[PDB]
Design an enzyme around this catalytic site. Sequence first.
Site, PDB file in Angstrom:
ATOM      1  N   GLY A 244     -99.627 114.506  19.503  1.00  0.00           N
ATOM      2  CA  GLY A 244    -100.103 114.581  18.209  1.00  0.00           C
ATOM      3  C   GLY A 244     -99.996 115.992  17.524  1.00  0.00           C
ATOM      4  N   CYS A 245     -99.984 117.056  18.306  1.00  0.00           N
ATOM      5  CA  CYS A 245    -100.389 118.292  17.811  1.00  0.00           C
ATOM      6  C   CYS A 245     -98.824 118.724  17.484  1.00  0.00           C
ATOM      7  CB  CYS A 245    -100.849 119.578  18.689  1.00  0.00           C
ATOM      8  SG  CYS A 245    -102.513 119.096  19.278  1.00  0.00           S
TER       9      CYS A 245
END
Length: 157
Positions: free
Chosen positions: A47-48
């Site tokens: 996600g990052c």
Amino acid sequence: HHHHMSVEVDRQVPDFTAPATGGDISLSDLKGRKLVLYFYPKDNTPGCTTEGLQFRELYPKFKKAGAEIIGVSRDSLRSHDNFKAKLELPFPLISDADEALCALFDVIKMKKMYGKEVRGIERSTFLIDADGVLRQAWRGIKVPGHVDDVLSAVQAL
């Protein structure tokens, strides 16, 4: 002020300085520009990585609208240098290893894993205007659609 002041929408953000890729950054360095300060849990996670790549893809539009992007996690500067290089990010990453900014922006969240509590970051973004005032917060958001929303907010200031 003899008590700690946390950030609030419509109020001045307290001045801070922190280590970053390329050298230290102070909030005062950003006076006269909008600042998207985005907190993400951890370098190198899915996600990052997507969040960083999506800010990268729209970076020229943020710049045209008078804004800078700065990502924040508690990872080391070494990790940040590697992560910035891997994603070819055109903007800095602050190493908040000592949690000064996470405390100031109130993004720490404890998570229970198998009866253990783990100290995490809640993925959150803050739009600070050229005057240093917090204009909008997004707390605990999901990545899909988020960079688009932040760009719209930057453009409408």
